[PDB]
Design a protein around this ligand. Structure first.
Ligand SMILES: CN1C(=O)[C@H](Cc2ccccc2)O[C@@H](c2ccc(Br)cc2)[C@H]1c1ccc(Br)cc1
Length: 85
């Protein structure tokens, strides 16, 4: 499935090296995760928990924190920031 990230998500992706305007979901996640690990928004003690309050990611998703273990919720939040081609 190819997707087109909306302006805010695209900015996020490109800030960690993304270069296209169109991506597969696996690529969106790849860069999104690189973004998270690069900024280290995860919690050192509980590494599956992500803190993104007052960050671009928080703006994007609409939440102050989330768990990378809830794939359905992450997929939901991501989909709101892209149009499926
Ligand atoms: C599937 N996946 C990835 O592709 C990347 C891999 C990656 C890591 C470092 C540098 C480049 C790419 O991130 C994974 C990830 C990210 C953050 C945490 Br916390 C756990 C796992 C993980 C992931 C990406 C996005 C979300 Br939201 C949740 C998990």
């Amino acid at each position: 499935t190819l997707v087109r990230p909306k302006p805010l998500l695209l900015k996020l992706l490109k800030s960690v090296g993304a270069q296209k305007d169109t991506y597969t979901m696996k690529e969106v996640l790849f860069y999104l995760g690189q973004y998270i690990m690069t900024k280290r928004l995860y919690d050192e003690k509980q590494q599956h928990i992500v803190y993104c309050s007052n960050d671009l990611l928080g703006d994007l998703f609409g939440v102050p924190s989330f768990s990378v273990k809830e794939h359905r919720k992450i997929y939901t939040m991501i989909y709101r920031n892209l149009v499926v081609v």
